[PDB]
Amino acid sequence: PISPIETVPVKLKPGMDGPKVKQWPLTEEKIKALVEICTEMEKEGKISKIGPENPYNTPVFAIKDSWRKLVDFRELNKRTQDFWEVQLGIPHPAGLKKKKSVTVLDVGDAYFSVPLDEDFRKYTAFTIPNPGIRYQYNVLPQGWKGSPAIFQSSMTKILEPFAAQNPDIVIYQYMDDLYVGSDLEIGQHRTKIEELRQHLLRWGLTTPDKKHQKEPPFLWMGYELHPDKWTVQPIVLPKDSWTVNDIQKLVGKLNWASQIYPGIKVRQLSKLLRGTKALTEVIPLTEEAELELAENREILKEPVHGVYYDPSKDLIAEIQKQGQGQWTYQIYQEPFKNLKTGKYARMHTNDVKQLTEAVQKITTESIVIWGKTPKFKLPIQKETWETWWTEYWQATWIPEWEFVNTPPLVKLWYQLEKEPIVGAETFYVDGAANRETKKAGYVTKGRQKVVPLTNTTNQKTELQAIYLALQDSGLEVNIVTDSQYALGIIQAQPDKSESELVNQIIEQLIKKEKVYLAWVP
Amino acid sequence: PIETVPVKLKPGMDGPKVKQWPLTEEKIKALVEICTEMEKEGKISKIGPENPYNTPVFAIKKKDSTKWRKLVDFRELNKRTQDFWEVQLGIPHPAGLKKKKSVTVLDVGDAYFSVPLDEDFRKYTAFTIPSINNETPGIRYQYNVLPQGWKGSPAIFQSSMTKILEPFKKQNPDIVIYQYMDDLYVGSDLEIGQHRTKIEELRQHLLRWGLTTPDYELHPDKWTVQPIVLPEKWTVNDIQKLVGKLNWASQIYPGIKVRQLSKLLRKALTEVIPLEAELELAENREILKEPVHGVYYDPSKDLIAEIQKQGQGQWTYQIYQEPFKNLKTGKYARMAHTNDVKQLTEAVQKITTESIVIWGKTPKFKLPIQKETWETWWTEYWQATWIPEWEFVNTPPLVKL
Numbered sequence: 062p063i064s065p066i067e068t069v070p071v072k073l074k075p076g077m078d079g080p081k082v083k084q085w086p087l088t089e090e091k092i093k094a095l096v097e098i099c100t101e102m103e104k105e106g107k108i109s110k111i112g113p114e115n116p117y118n119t120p121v122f123a124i125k126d127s128w129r130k131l132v133d134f135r136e137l138n139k140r141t142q143d144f145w146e147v148q149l150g151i152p153h154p155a156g157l158k159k160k161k162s163v164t165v166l167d168v169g170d171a172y173f174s175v176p177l178d179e180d181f182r183k184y185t186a187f188t189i190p191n192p193g194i195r196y197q198y199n200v201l202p203q204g205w206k207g208s209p210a211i212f213q214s215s216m217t218k219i220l221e222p223f224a225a226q227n228p229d230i231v232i233y234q235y236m237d238d239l240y241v242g243s244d245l246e247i248g249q250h251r252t253k254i255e256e257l258r259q260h261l262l263r264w265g266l267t268t269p270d271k272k273h274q275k276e277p278p279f280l281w282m283g284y285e286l287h288p289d290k291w292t293v294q295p296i297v298l299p300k301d302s303w304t305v306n307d308i309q310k311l312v313g314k315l316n317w318a319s320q321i322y323p324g325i326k327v328r329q330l331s332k333l334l335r336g337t338k339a340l341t342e343v344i345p346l347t348e349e350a351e352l353e354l355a356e357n358r359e360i361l362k363e364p365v366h367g368v369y370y371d372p373s374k375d376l377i378a379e380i381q382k383q384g385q386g387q388w389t390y391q392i393y394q395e396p397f398k399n400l401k402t403g404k405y406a407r408m409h410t411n412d413v414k415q416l417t418e419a420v421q422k423i424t425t426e427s428i429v430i431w432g433k434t435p436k437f438k439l440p441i442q443k444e445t446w447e448t449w450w451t452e453y454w455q456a457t458w459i460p461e462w463e464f465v466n467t468p469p470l471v472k473l474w475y476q477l478e479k480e481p482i483v484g485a486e487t488f489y490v491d492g493a494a495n496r497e498t499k500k501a502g503y504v505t506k507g508r509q510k511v512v513p514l515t516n517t518t519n520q521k522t523e524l525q526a527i528y529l530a531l532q533d534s535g536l537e538v539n540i541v542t543d544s545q546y547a548l549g550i551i552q553a554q555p556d557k558s559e560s561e562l563v564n565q566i567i568e569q570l571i572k573k574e575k576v577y578l579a580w581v582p
Numbered sequence: 583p584i585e586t587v588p589v590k591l592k593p594g595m596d597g598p599k600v601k602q603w604p605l606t607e608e609k610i611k612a613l614v615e616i617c618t619e620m621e622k623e624g625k626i627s628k629i630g631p632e633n634p635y636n637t638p639v640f641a642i643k644k645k646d647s648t649k650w651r652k653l654v655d656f657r658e659l660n661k662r663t664q665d666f667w668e669v670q671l672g673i674p675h676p677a678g679l680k681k682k683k684s685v686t687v688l689d690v691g692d693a694y695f696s697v698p699l700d701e702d703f704r705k706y707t708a709f710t711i712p713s714i715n716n717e718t719p720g721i722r723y724q725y726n727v728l729p730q731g732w733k734g735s736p737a738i739f740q741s742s743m744t745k746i747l748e749p750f751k752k753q754n755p756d757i758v759i760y761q762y763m764d765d766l767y768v769g770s771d772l773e774i775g776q777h778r779t780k781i782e783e784l785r786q787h788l789l790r791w792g793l794t795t796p797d798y799e800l801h802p803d804k805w806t807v808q809p810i811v812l813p814e815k816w817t818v819n820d821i822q823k824l825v826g827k828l829n830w831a832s833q834i835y836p837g838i839k840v841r842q843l844s845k846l847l848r849k850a851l852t853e854v855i856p857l858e859a860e861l862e863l864a865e866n867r868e869i870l871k872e873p874v875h876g877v878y879y880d881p882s883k884d885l886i887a888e889i890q891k892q893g894q895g896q897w898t899y900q901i902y903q904e905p906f907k908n909l910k911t912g913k914y915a916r917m918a919h920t921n922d923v924k925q926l927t928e929a930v931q932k933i934t935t936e937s938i939v940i941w942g943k944t945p946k947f948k949l950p951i952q953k954e955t956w957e958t959w960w961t962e963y964w965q966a967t968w969i970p971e972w973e974f975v976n977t978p979p980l981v982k983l
């Protein structure tokens with residue numbers, strides 16, 4: 062129905078006017094179809110025939126499981142005012158508050174049921190064809206710019222009276238859907254829903270009847286929402302010849318399945334497409350990737366489920382290291398049943414850093430989803446955290462955290478000293494490199510000079526000369542350098558890196574009993 | 583019903599469409615209670631989908647109470663109104679305020695919730711209270727009176743301010759008063775007790791003439807471009823380190839002659855050594871406190887502030903507009919409960935107040951923190967009604983100060 066709701070006043074972008082696109086008559090059997098629809102639409106108030114009162118025009122169309130009208134409004138859309146955004150995100154099943162009964166009422170003829178502002182109707186005119194019959198829209202036209210936002214506003218207002226009288230029942234508004242939950246007996250609940258239908262009916266809004274109410278499991282935005290548990294719809298990943306396109310679709314499904322399937326790891330499969338490359342360009346299958354996907358098919362061989370949220374119970378997140386710069390986390394309120402899961406990654410950095418980064422990802426998500434931060438049970442001890450940050454240049458803060466001993470625990474693999482020692486050496490280590498052609502040294506023993514190389518970078522050489530300082534190094538020792546590059550790297554106390562030379566320096570630093578470094582101009 | 587000053591954006595400019603940050607449930611209920619009272623009082627009215635604009639809203643904890651405050655982020659609207667709206671009706675920045683021995687800071691923002699806001703400008707104050715987990719579309723409002731945090735608010739109210747302040751400003755000719763946003767900066771060369779009485783007279787004088795005040799003492803006499811120096815002690819390590827920072831110094835001031843002190847070994851020597859070099863360091867230390875000339879403030883250029891984590895509850899900062907060009911240098915410190923984040927918050931709010939007094943603008947900050955961590959907890963200690971620009975640093979070189 063046309064609806065007794067008030068209309069949102071519309072304007073055109075300042076100093077613009079209605080679209081004057083003309084139509085190309087195309088098929089004329091379709092014109093017989095289009096006259097059929099437009100006669101019904103005039104019969105229910107949706108459109109009204111108009112004279113040639115200098116109106117504007119927009120195209121038509123007839124595209125049809127095998128017709129259906131489709132005005133192109135692109136030209137009007139470009140001249141209509143801007144509206145509030147509609148709904149950027151989607152509610153997460155982990156955030157859903159548990160309810161005794163749930164009901165999916167699918168409104169019918171949504172946009173067509175909400176009147177359109179009178180003074181803006183002229184601009185929705187569309188002509189139907191060797192003269193031509195005229196027509197304008199009386200309700201919210203499909204594909205018009207302000208249809209989605211004005212329906213959402215209208216539905217929000219139509220519900221205010223009924224919510225008022227029903228503070229117990231919770232209604233979610235999504236697109237053309239209402240998801241409606243309660244904590245009362247089914248017979249009670251079936252009565253309340255039936256009141257919602259009649260309320261909506263009076264306003265022009267049709268809904269499914271009891272036999273036609275969708276029944277669970279609800280397949281919705283890529284999940285299965287069961288009555289008391291939720292999961293992802295069955296993720297499906299196949300051959301041997303793959304594409305960039307095939308790799309991308311696959312990493313999509315494993316990120317997707319990773320919100321409830323713990324331990325998914327997609328790193329290997331991701332690095333493969335790390336370059337611009339192409340879309341059809343077939344890509345080789347690395348063996349470590351064929352492992353990840355092999356492990357991944359094992360996680361997905363058996364099903365797992367999330368539970369819904371209870372805001373009375375408290376929120377607990379746990380992190381556990383996976384190796385290779387990958388971490389995996391699980392939020393729950395009771396230890397068995399996870400609200401949801403997920404994973405973290407990094408783009409060469411100490412573990413405590415990458416750990417405190419993971420806590421960041423979780424806090425952000427916790428606030429977006431439950432409006433509360435999750436209490437944390439991490440595999441680390443104050444001794445390890447307090448010292449890392451306190452001599453970390455960067456600011457960091459982590460919410461309540463209790464220790465859990467679930468190796469692999471994260472720890473400080475080594476540690477530099479703050480003041481010099483009871484006597485070791487110098488190791489003034491340089492890395493002379495000719496940017497025109499393919500150094501190393503220490504003046505403690507003065508046994509400097511080990512080996513240059515081709516394509517060796519002065520930055521690699523200086524860092525290698527510090528590793529070269531580690532060569533003659535014994536126990537408690539002290540090195541020095543004029544290369545700022547080197548200092549920042551070992552000072553960051555990294556625990557793994559891409560150049561194993563730097564990983565060797567960690568093995569040296571991990572081995573040596575007391576180290577102290579310094580820089581000079 | 584006062585006549586509404588009309589507000590025009592610099593033509594060719596649209597209104598803010600900033601996205602609202604997700605908030606915690608504690609803060610949303612707070613904003614819902616605040617916003618409901620504000621809608622009863624007429625200060626704000628709910629709006630429709632044909633308003634496209636948005637600016638972000640946060641909740642903070644005011645001075646120290648349970649009482650939650652609502653804080654609007656008009657950074658975007660400020661850049662699109664106050665620029666040429668200040669040029670229209672701007673507050674002249676008083677030069678002497680940097681000179682006085684004490685400067686106190688009076689919140690005067692609640693007064694703005696009286697003067698009605700021009701009807702055609704209201705749509706651009708749209709803001710949104712968020713919901714949680716996308717459960718509902720947010721709650722939407724605009725303003726009908728001068729909003730706090732819009733730099734056009736003091737610009738419009740400045741005429742009312744001058745009338746109430748006319749008598750206090752004659753009986754007290756020595757006092758420098760500056761308005762910036764929701765704050766009234768008062769400086770006097772009086773004694774601390776005397777200064778505090780004069781402030782209390784001012785608050786009283788303001789209270790009785792309607793302008794509701796709450797009912798932060800700065801000492802800019804002790805602010806300068808603090809020179810880089812080192813306390814006296816010298817081992818090789820101490821010598822080499824001291825040798826180092828002098829090289830970074832030759833930059834901010836070409837005149838150092840480290841080679842004179844550089845005379846040293848050329849074997850294990852991290853032990854001890856006796857120091858002419860004594861004379862050389864003495865002359866340099868004189869040149870060190872020398873005020874670096876060639877340092878000029880251009881109003882066209884923006885103000886950049888950088889902060890560095892020193893350690894043990896203390897922080898150092900440098901405000902410049904160009905490479906080097908160090909217009910101010912200083913230190914911040916705390917006792918306690920301070921964390922990496924909370925101190926930085928208090929630091930920033932001390933580095934902003936300083937640029938406001940000195941140059942009447944806030945500085946755009948480079949911050950030593952992961953962006954998302956800042957974005958999550960900055961409001962948990964923010965207590966200013968304004969918000970500076972900020973970007974996040976990544977690679978901290980050992981600047982050596």
Ligand SMILES: CN(C)C(=O)CCOc1ccccc1Oc1cccc2cc(C#N)ccc12
Pocket residue numbers: 152157158159160163164165231232233240241242243277279280281286287288289369
């Ligand atoms: C979801 N469920 C069975 C629960 O048991 C969890 C409780 O979910 C609700 C709580 C209040 C209102 C409505 C609730 O239900 C929903 C919330 C959000 C999206 C929904 C999408 C569909 C579809 N297609 C069906 C129901 C939905």
